[PDB]
Amino acid sequence: MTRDQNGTWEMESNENFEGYMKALDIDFATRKIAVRLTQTKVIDQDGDNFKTKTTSTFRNYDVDFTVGVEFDEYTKSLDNRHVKALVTWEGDVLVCVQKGEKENRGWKQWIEGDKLYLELTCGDQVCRQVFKKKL
Numbered sequence: 001m002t003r004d005q006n007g008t009w010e011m012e013s014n015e016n017f018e019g020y021m022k023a024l025d026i027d028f029a030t031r032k033i034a035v036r037l038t039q040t041k042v043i044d045q046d047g048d049n050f051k052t053k054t055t056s057t058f059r060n061y062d063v064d065f066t067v068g069v070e071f072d073e074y075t076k077s078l079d080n081r082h083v084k085a086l087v088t089w090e091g092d093v094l095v096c097v098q099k100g101e102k103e104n105r106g107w108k109q110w111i112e113g114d115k116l117y118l119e120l121t122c123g124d125q126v127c128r129q130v131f132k133k134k135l
């Protein structure tokens with residue numbers, strides 16, 4: 001029973017964010033700033049209802065969803081694309097498919113210990129992020 005992802009989470013590692021951004025066609029000036037940043041993620045979860053805020057000194061990104069309910073997602077201030085997003089549970093892993101112009105786009109997020117893991121995929125690029133829970 002580890003579906004409860006509530007909390008404030010501070011990034012401790014960010015593997016291949018460069019490759020994931022390049023797969024999304026982010027220009028190199030934007031990548032040069034974005035690759036260096038520590039992100040914070042705030043998850044406010046009530047059952048299958050999620051309100052999430054991911055923040056940094058450069059850009060912030062909010063996304064709210066209900067697990068199992070497809071929604072329109074506009075990745076404002078990121079790659080600025082429109083996708084149809086669906087989040088589901090696979091066991092206790094939160095899985096998102098972002099259907100749109102990029103193949104194999106989505107993410108998976110899950111808890112282990114006091115760490116949150118987030119793997120973001122676009123095409124043949126996977127970015128692996130780890131966050132530690134803030135007290």
Ligand SMILES: CCCCC/C=C\C/C=C\C/C=C\C/C=C\CCCC(=O)OC(CO)CO
Pocket residue numbers: 021024026030034039041052054055056058059060061063077078079107109118120
């Ligand atoms: C929002 C902080 C980082 C922003 C970096 C700025 C520009 C880079 C442009 C594009 C890269 C694409 C995505 C950023 C990667 C992660 C932020 C969270 C994305 C997301 O949907 O996470 C889900 C799962 O945690 C939010 O519910």
